Design a protein around this ligand. Structure first.
Ligand SMILES: [Mg+2]
Ligand SMILES: [Mg+2]
Ligand SMILES: [Zn+2]
Ligand SMILES: [Zn+2]
Ligand SMILES: [Zn+2]
Ligand SMILES: [Zn+2]
Lengths: 449, 449
C-alpha cells in the first residue's frame, strides 16, 4: 500500500437516541484493517507519550471537548490498538511493584529492561543500558526529544541520562543524592550534564533553571551549564520566534530550546477538585490560562518544528514527544488543566499522523507511561475524595473524582492502559504487550541494534 | 486459514530483572495478526461479558493470581483488541449520562440503541426493539444465556425482556413499578414472565426465588412461574448433576437451570476493604469460599454444557455468558471476591476459545459493560476510601483502593474499557468502538437481520 488508513471518523454516526445513532464504525473493518498491516521497516518513529494518560483520562477529556459521542482527530484516529503492562521492580527484591513512577516506566520503554522506581537508564543493579535515543543516533539517525515539562523530568531525561536517582537534575543534586554519578567523583554527571553530552539534534522543553548551575569539574567547570551549551555548539532558543527561526539543527548545529524556567505553563485554567465539590460547588467550564504567554510554543508547535528539522536526515529520525502536564494536573486534582493538556497533546498527535500519513514510512505510537487517579463518576456521587462538576460540550454535566490519596497529591495507578500505533510494525502494539516490548518494537521497526 | 491464532503465551519471557526479561511478545506480529483477520461469516457467537470488569479489574486479578508478569490463559489470549465507549442517555434530555448502569449498557449491545439507566430493551421513548438473542432465534439459530447472577438481573434479562424498569423482576414488582408492562394491564409481563415467554434453548443462572411468584393474569394465572415453566415444556435443573444429565435442549425441550435462590455464590472469600486497611490491617490472601456448594455449577461448567447442547444446531447458535459477580464484589469493596470472580470468568473464556479454536467459525468476544470503582495504588498509599493489602502470587504485596463513594456501595465508572475478540469479523472490535457497534458486529458476523 502507498499508505495505510489512519482512522477517519469514529464519532457517533448520528442522533445518539435512535437505532445505530451512536455507532462509531460505519462498515466492517477486516479489509481496512488488512491494509494498515505492514512489516516494511519504519524509516522514522515518533513516540507521543501522554504522561499518566490512561483510558480514564482519554474518555474524560473527549467527553469535555468533543462530547461523549465525539472523536479525537489525533488521539483516536490510530487504527491499531492494545493494552500494555507497566509495573516496576522492587530494588531490594527484584519483584514487581505494581504501581510504577514516571522514571522506571520511561526506562522500561527506552531501554527494554524493568527497573526500580526513580531510576533513569540504569537497572535494579544500577548498571547502565543504551536507550533507543542513543542507538538511533549511533546508527546515524536524527534525534528529537520534545516535552512540556522540564527537560530534566523523567520522560525526557530517561533517553539521555543514567542516574541512580531521578532527582539528580543538575551538578549539586547529583553530588549529594547521586555521589556515584557526580562528574567530580568520576560519574558521567547529572541529568542536565548528560543531556548536553548526549547531543540529540532537536531538544525542546522547559527547565532552563538547572542550566543556571555550573560544573563542579570536567572541561567546563565554573561555566554555567548554559554557557557550556553555547560553548559546545548549541543553538539555544527561548521562544516561539527563536524556534521558528531555526532553519537547521544537526550534530554540528544541535538545537536546544528552553522555553520555561521550570515546567511549561498549562493551557486551560480551572479550579481544583474539592470534597463534595460536585454538590456544594457549581458546574465548571474551563477557560484559557492567562499565564501562558503568546511567546511560549505549544506542544503541537514544538512537535512541528522538530519533524521539520529532523526530517532533513536522509537516514531517518527518532522523536519522542511528551504531553507532560496531563500527569501533573491529575496529580493536582485540577480537571480543567488535566483535560486541556490532553487536548494539547491531541494536536501534536495530529501533526504526528499528518507527517506520518504523507511520508508513509513512519511508525507513530501514542500511549502513556502509567495510569492515574482520575475517575468519571455519576453526577450525584458522594465520594470520600475530591470531585468537581464540569459542563461538557454535550450540554450535559460530567462529574470527575480523585479519591486515592489523602496526602496532598493524587496518585498513579497500576491498571493496564491503551497503546495505539499506526504504520510499519504497528502490528506489535495489538493484543496485550509490555512497556518493554515497546522498546524492542521501536528497535526492529527501525532495524536497529 | 483453517484456523486463526489464539494468543499463545504473552506472559513475561524470563527474569523480569534482565533486559527483555519482561517482554511478552517474542516476535513481530504483523503476520500472525494477518492470520487472525477474516470476514467469512461467524457461524456461532459467544459473547463473554465481565460485569464491570474494566482494565483495572483485569490487571488486579492477573497480578494476584498470575503475578504481574503473568498471562490469562483465556482472558488475555485474544488476538484482537480495542477500547469502546458505553455512556448512557438521560431519559429527559436525550443527552449523554457518562456513567451507565448494568441495564442501559446491556441494552446498548443487545439492541444497538442507547438508552436511559434502568431500561431493558426499550429506548428513552420506552419503545421496544428486537434483541440479538431474539433475532438469532427467529433466524433459526440456537440461543443460550448463561450467568452467575439471578436470571432477572440486567445482563441476562436484557436479551429476553422489555421493561421500563430493570426492577420489574416478577409479577408484583411489575404491576406496581411497571404498570405499563403488567401482564394483567395488558403488558408483555415481568422480566421473569418475558424470559419464559422468550424460550431461549439454554438458560442457566440463579434467581429461582422469583419463579416462586404466581401469574396475575394470562393463561397460567394462579400457577407459580416455576409451574408454568414445567407446564410449557421446560426442563428445570437445580444442580451440577441435573445439568450434566441434560442430553438435549432445544425449542421442544428447552432447558432452564435455576442453581440459586438469588445470585450464585462467590468463588473466593476474603475480607472487605477498610479505611486505612493497607496500614492498620495485615496482608490478605484469599481462600476458597465455604458457602459455595459442590453441587452448584461453576461458570465454566455452565458455559461448557451450553456449548455442548447448543452446538447441536445445524444452523448455529448465539450464547451470552456473564461473569456477573465481578461487579457486585467491586461494589462491595471485597477484593478477594472480585478477583476470584474474574478467575472464574477466565476459565469459561478458556472453554469459549477451546471450542472457538476447533470449530473455526465462532466469533468469541470478551468485554465488560462498564468500568468500576477499583484501583491499584502503591503499598504506602493513604487514601480517603477503602484499601486492602493483598499477597499476590509474585510474593509481593499489591494494594487495592475503592474511594469514589461514601454511600455503602462503591460505584461504576465512565472510562472506556477493553474489548477483545477472536475469529470471523473480529476485526470490528479493534480501534475505538461503541457498545452499540458490538450489537451490529454480532449481526453482520451472523449475517442476521
Ligand atoms: Mg513527565
Ligand atoms: Mg450484569
Ligand atoms: Zn508519569
Ligand atoms: Zn506523577
Ligand atoms: Zn454492570
Ligand atoms: Zn454494578
Amino acid at each position: 500500500t502507498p499508505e495505510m488508513p489512519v482512522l477517519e471518523n469514529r464519532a457517533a454516526q448520528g442522533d445518539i437516541t435512535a437505532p445505530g445513532g451512536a455507532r462509531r464504525l460505519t462498515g466492517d473493518q477486516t479489509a481496512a484493517l488488512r491494509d494498515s498491516l505492514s512489516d516494511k521497516p519504519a524509516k522514522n518513529i515518533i513516540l507521543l507519550i501522554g504522561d499518566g494518560m490512561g483510558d480514564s483520562e482519554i474518555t474524560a477529556a473527549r467527553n469535555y471537548a468533543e462530547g461523549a459521542g465525539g472523536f479525537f482527530k489525533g488521539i483516536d484516529a490510530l487504527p491499531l490498538t492494545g493494552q500494555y503492562t507497566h509495573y516496576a521492580l522492587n530494588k531490594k527484591t527484584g519483584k514487581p511493584d505494581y504501581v510504577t513512577d514516571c522514571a522506571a516506566s520511561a526506562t522500561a520503554w527506552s531501554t527494554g529492561v524493568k527497573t526500580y522506581n526513580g531510576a533513569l537508564g540504569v537497572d535494579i543493579h544500577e548498571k547502565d543500558h543504551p536507550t533507543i535515543l542513543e542507538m538511533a543516533k549511533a546508527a546515524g539517525l536524527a534525534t528529537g526529544n520534545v516535552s512540556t515539562a522540564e527537560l530534566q523530568d523523567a520522560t525526557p531525561a530517561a533517553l539521555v541520562a543514567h542516574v541512580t536517582s531521578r532527582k539528580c537534575y543538575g551538578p549539586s543534586a547529583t553530588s549529594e543524592k547521586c555521589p556515584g554519578n557526580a562528574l567530580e567523583k568520576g560519574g558521567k554527571g547529572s541529568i542536565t550534564e548528560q543531556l548536553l553530552n548526549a547531543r540529540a539534534d532537536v531538544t525542546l522543553g522547559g527547565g532552563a533553571k538547572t542550566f543556571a548551575e555550573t560544573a563542579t569539574a570536567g572541561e567546563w567547570q565554573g561555566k554555567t551549564l548554559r554557557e557550556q551549551a553555547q560553548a559546545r555548539g548549541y543553538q539555544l532558543v527561548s521562544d516561539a520566534a527563536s524556534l521558528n527561526s531555526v532553519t537547521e539543527a544537526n550534530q554540528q548545529k544541535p538545537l536546544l530550546g528552553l522555553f520555561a524556567d521550570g515546567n511549561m505553563p498549562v493551557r486551560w485554567l480551572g479550579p481544583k477538585a474539592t470534597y463534595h465539590g460536585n454538590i456544594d460547588k457549581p458546574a465548571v467550564t474551563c477557560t484559557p490560562n492567562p499565564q501562558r504567554n503568546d511567546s511560549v510554543p505549544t506542544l503541537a508547535q514544538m512537535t512541528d518544528k522538530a519533524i521539520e528539522l529532523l526530517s532533513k536526515n536522509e537516514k531517518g529520525f527518532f522523536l519522542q514527544v511528551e504531553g507532560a502536564s496531563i500527569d501533573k494536573q491529575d496529580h493536582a486534582a485540577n480537571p480543567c488543566g488535566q483535560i486541556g493538556e490532553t487536548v494539547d497533546l491531541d494536536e501534536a498527535v495530529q501533526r504526528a499522523l499528518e507527517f506520518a500519513k504523507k511520508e508513509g514510512n513512519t511508525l507513530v505510537i501514542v500511549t502513556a507511561d502509567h495510569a492515574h487517579a482520575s475517575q468519571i463518576v455519576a453526577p450525584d456521587t458522594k465520594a470520600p475524595g475530591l470531585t468537581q462538576a464540569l459542563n461538557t460540550k454535550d450540554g450535559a454535566v460530567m462529574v470527575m473524582s480523585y479519591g486515592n490519596s489523602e496526602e496532598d497529591s493524587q496518585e498513579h495507578t497500576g491498571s493496564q492502559l491503551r497503546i495505539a500505533a499506526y504504520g510499519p510494525h504497528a502490528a506489535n502494539v495489538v493484543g496485550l504487550t509490555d512497556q518493554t516490548d515497546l522498546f524492542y518494537t521501536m528497535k526492529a521497526a527501525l532495524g536497529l541494534k
